Design a protein around this ligand. Structure first.
Ligand code: NA
Length: 130
């Protein structure tokens, strides 16, 4: 599923993402925008280390979910990576919450640093009623 901007903003707020571990909703929106373009089925193979990024937040198979083919990987979210490709984003949100529970927080995603950090991210949530 490819979510529309405000549709996604409203869903995330309902899922308790606004202010989660100090992270505003607009930041989560900026991350989803740059990682997948709000697309839940997005997958990206990293030829360099044999891992794959899954779903709306492009969560990596090396530390977060299990896809069985990634070398020396863990499954911290305790989920099959398939769970991160559903139209229902409940599991992906639960896993994203787990990711930011580590010291790096939202910085764990390089895209966030490149395109969201220190920028005016208000545009991502404007007019959505959140
Ligand atoms: Na894994």
């Amino acid at each position: 599923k490819v979510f529309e901007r405000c549709e996604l903003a409203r869903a995330l707020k309902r899922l308790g993402m606004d202010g989660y571990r100090g992270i505003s909703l607009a930041n989560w929106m900026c991350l989803a925008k740059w990682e997948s373009g709000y697309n839940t089925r997005a997958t990206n193979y990293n030829a360099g280390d044999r891992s794959t990024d899954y779903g709306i937040f492009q969560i990596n198979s090396r530390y977060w979910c299990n896809d069985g083919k990634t070398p020396g990987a863990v499954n911290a979210c305790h989920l099959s990576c398939s769970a991160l490709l559903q139209d229902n984003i409940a599991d992906a949100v639960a896993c994203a919450k787990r990711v930011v529970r580590d010291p790096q927080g939202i910085r764990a995603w390089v895209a966030w640093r490149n395109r969201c950090q220190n920028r005016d991210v208000r545009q991502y949530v404007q007019g959505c009623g959140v």
